[PDB]
From Swiss-Prot:
Its EC number is 7.2.2.10. Catalyzes the hydrolysis of ATP coupled with the transport of calcium. The transport is electrogenic with a probable ATP:Ca(2+):H(+) stoichiometry of 1:1:1. May have an important role in survival of the bacterium when stressed by a combination of a high calcium concentration and alkaline pH. This is Calcium-transporting ATPase lmo0841. Signal peptide: none annotated. The keyword Ribosomal protein does not apply. Ca(2+) binds at V264, A265, I267, E269, N693, D697. CDD domains: P-type_ATPase_Ca_prok. It comes from the Bacteria. Phosphorylation is inhibited by EGTA and vanadate. ATPase activity is stimulated by Sr(2+). Inhibited by very high concentrations of cyclopiazonic acid (CPA).
Amino acid sequence: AEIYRKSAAETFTQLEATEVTKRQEKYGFNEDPLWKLFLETFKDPMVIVLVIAALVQLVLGEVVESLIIFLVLIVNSIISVVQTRKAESSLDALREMSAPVAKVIRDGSKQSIHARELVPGDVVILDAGDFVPADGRLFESGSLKIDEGMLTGESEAVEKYIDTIPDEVGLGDRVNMVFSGSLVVYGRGMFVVTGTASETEIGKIQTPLQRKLESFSKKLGLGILALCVLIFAVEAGRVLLGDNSADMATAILNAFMFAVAVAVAAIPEALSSIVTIVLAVGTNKMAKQHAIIRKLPAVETLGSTSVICTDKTGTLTQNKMTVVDYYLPDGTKENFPESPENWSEGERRLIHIAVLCNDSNINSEGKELGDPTEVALIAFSNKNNQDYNEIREKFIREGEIPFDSDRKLMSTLHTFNENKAMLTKGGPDVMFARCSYVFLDGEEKPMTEEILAKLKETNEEFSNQALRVLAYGYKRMPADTTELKLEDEQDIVLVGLTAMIDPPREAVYASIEESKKAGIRTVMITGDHKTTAQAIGRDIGLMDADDIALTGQELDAMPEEELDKKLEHIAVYARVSPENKIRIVKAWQKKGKITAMTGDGVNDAPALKQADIGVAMGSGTDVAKDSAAMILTDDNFVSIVDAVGVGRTVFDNIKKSIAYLFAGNLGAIIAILFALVLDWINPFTALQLLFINLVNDSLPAIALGMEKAEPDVMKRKPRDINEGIFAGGTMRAVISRGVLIGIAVIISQYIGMQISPEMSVAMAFTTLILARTLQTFAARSNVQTAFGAGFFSNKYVIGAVLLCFVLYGITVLPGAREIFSIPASFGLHEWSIAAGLALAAVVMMEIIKVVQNKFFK
Ligand SMILES: [Ca+2]
């Protein structure tokens, strides 16, 4: 768009890149009807077969049944699209608060607007992992590794430079602009946005559980339709009256009505509705649990996470350390808070290097900006003997090493008292192998075996206390103001060692224990010294007895054949790498064991992609979130355990709701079949069965899918990788539930047979519908009873039960008894027998549940 040929200053002049609202309304902002969705949601095969049944039931000129079935379709359609609109609003909220925020320099005004409210002509800084939202010209960048797999499918990391492209335009390998829709793999993206999202080049361009459940629905539909074909054949050939069959031409309509109503009852039309509704409410629960899930198909498998590979920093640690103990080569206890003066030479040297190498500062109280280790060190300095940060401003910062990932020598040089003071921090072992002088008062003499042994002794002593520890050095040549380079890095003295405790977040111990009780083996990666992380894991609670831990160096130097054997008994990885992250996530995925990675860094994205349910931290980079199936806003590990608990609750809601629906439908089916085998009038007419399918297979099933967490969700083994909807325990529950309720309907039909066939039909219908509405109570869980869990504890269930009771209260009205095949008027006993049978059914059902709690497991 005429920006390819311009250089940096030419883009500044031509596009007026440096009122901001004027440019926003002038250049433009850089950001499906619901009835159309309702029209397009008829793809459900259950909805298709029910709508063809509704249209044929309309074409025989019968009105009330047609309105009943049509009402079933519209209520499930409107509840599906209403919860779909709720999911759309939730997704818009997730895209709003977790929007990619680009740090904007603008006209020198350092702030950070979101992606939608950007405007061309303002400077934007892109750090590593800061996904660039809008295309724009770049002037300087240091090795800006930019991949373009989404903008144009360019998998290569193109390094944008100062060079422009005059008299040529091409979206391929070009360096002139950093286009939108691109991820900063590495580099510093100091560029100016030149494009509205409309003019950006990228702007110009169901779940596996859902698929398995639709396959199960199609199998059940074929079987059920075969069953109704058999039922229609029974009504046809079993009796057929005599040879003349009276008026069989005008009497096949009622038999086809019975078979069709059997199809409507048995078919779970609200299957996909239940799944979508509980996925929406589960996602809302994850949002309540500080867990913004990105990939929608990841909700079902979150209940199946038999392993989670987390990291201690961020999740198992709220940052802001407090160093509790320290080592000095002279040797004493803590003496910093009391000491007004410099006190011992080791203490004062350690304090000055801790302050000087500290990149961060306390600033205003409660405001921490830098690295957590440096924030902790300056908070320690300011905690003991009051203010100590004021000493840094009277100390120049000449030579500062940029703290390379292979260096661990964050340096500092001052000219205030010492001329060329080589002041650096780093890891314990790296300084121990690098620094070569001991600090005993003014003596600066090299290491020996016993001295190095004592340093290592205090190092492992701090390590087994779960204390990460840093080493410091002072010794330097006089020389003069150097070029801030390494110079002489083999002659450094050893100042004392300060070991900082890594405190876990609140309720980390409880969540860890409840995850270990749930069979969810937890795995924690770290980058510090090994036995420090081992003691941290012992503190957390994932280390006991036979468990082992291996470093990253041993991780990448060991073939997978023995690592597979060792994998099940190891939870701590130290000095890990993203390649080792790929290794561990693939090894955990190999033996089933659904994995949830944790990487928040930029190059952790391959580990997040290969992870089944890899979660990126909210404080982490945006490219990891793109590579992640889900995000934690509060970044805590307790959010992961709450997330997998919510996933288990959602899958248990699937199991319980499908159990309720299939059990009631099977009870009706076996009632009809038992009336069929014994040469009996069928228990329910067409309109009665359609009204039962109206009352249930609906809002009560939705409410049963809205059931909260039973007290044993974190006490069970994780679900298998496959869906396993027809689990053996839940199949036993389904068959017992359906057989019992059908037994109640059969007994009611037999009692009604003692009076009249019409009384039998009416009593069987009311027994079935009352037993469905009251079995909604007993099917709230497979562990807790309706009274045990509390009736009002599930507000949706009791509200829906009252709703269906009111709706069934149409039957008692005399104006609807004719269409419902309810004859005459009741004194007491046309209702009392049915109510007693239904109450006995649900109480039998409940003591069966208690027996499974008491006798069985
Ligand atoms: Ca149904």
